[PDB]
Amino acid sequence: PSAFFLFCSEYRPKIKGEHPGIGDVAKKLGEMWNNT
DNA sequence: GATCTGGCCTGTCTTACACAGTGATGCAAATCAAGTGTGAAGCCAGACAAAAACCCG
């Protein structure tokens, strides 16, 4: 388990309740993990 | 005597005679680890209907 490991799923529902899909949901989550 | 020649001595020159196998490093490629809802390949439904292999009048 790494940062993105426990960051792609722990914050997954925060976009999965908006994005039905499951790449596009965590996609912008990767961008907000990269910005920081 | 004088020389010839033949035998022995080295002296070079030819082919040959044992290296891939050890443990280590160090990069490139693969995988894999989650996320989450998908569809796809079969599963099996008791019972029914078109073909290969061989019996049969």
From Swiss-Prot:
Query: Which residues are recorded with the post-translational modification Cysteine sulfonic acid (-SO3H)?
Result: C8
Which residues, renumbered to this chain, carry the PTM Phosphoserine?
S2
Show the domain comment: HMG box 2 mediates pro-inflammatory cytokine-stimulating activity and binding to TLR4. However, not involved in mediating immunogenic activity in the context of apoptosis-induced immune tolerance.
- Record function comment: Multifunctional redox sensitive protein with various roles in different cellular compartments. In the nucleus is one of the major chromatin-associated non-histone proteins and acts as a DNA chaperone involved in replication, transcription, chromatin remodeling, V(D)J recombination, DNA repair and genome stability. Proposed to be an universal biosensor for nucleic acids. Promotes host inflammatory response to sterile and infectious signals and is involved in the coordination and integration of innate and adaptive immune responses. Nuclear functions are attributed to fully reduced HGMB1. Associates with chromatin and binds DNA with a preference to non-canonical DNA structures such as single-stranded DNA, DNA-containing cruciforms or bent structures, supercoiled DNA and ZDNA. Can bent DNA and enhance DNA flexibility by looping thus providing a mechanism to promote activities on various gene promoters by enhancing transcription factor binding and/or bringing distant regulatory sequences into close proximity.
| UniProt PTM | Phosphorylated at serine residues. Phosphorylation in both NLS regions is required for cytoplasmic translocation followed by secretion. Acetylated on multiple sites upon stimulation with LPS. Acetylation on lysine residues in the nuclear localization signals (NLS 1 and NLS 2) leads to cytoplasmic localization and subsequent secretion.
- This chain's source organism reads Equus caballus
* Residues where N6-acetyllysine is found: K27, K28
| Family per similarity comment | Belongs to the HMGB family.
| Secretion signal span | none
Q: What is this protein called?
A: High mobility group protein B1
Subunit structure, as described in the record? Interacts (fully reduced HMGB1) with CXCL12; probably in a 1:2 ratio involving two molecules of CXCL12, each interacting with one HMG box of HMGB1; inhibited by glycyrrhizin. Associates with the TLR4:LY96 receptor complex. Component of the RAG complex composed of core components RAG1 and RAG2, and associated component HMGB1 or HMGB2. Interacts (in cytoplasm upon starvation) with BECN1; inhibits the interaction of BECN1 and BCL2 leading to promotion of autophagy. Interacts with KPNA1; involved in nuclear import. Interacts with SREBF1, TLR2, TLR4, TLR9, PTPRZ1, APEX1, FEN1, POLB, TERT.
Cellular location(s): Nucleus; Chromosome; Cytoplasm; Secreted
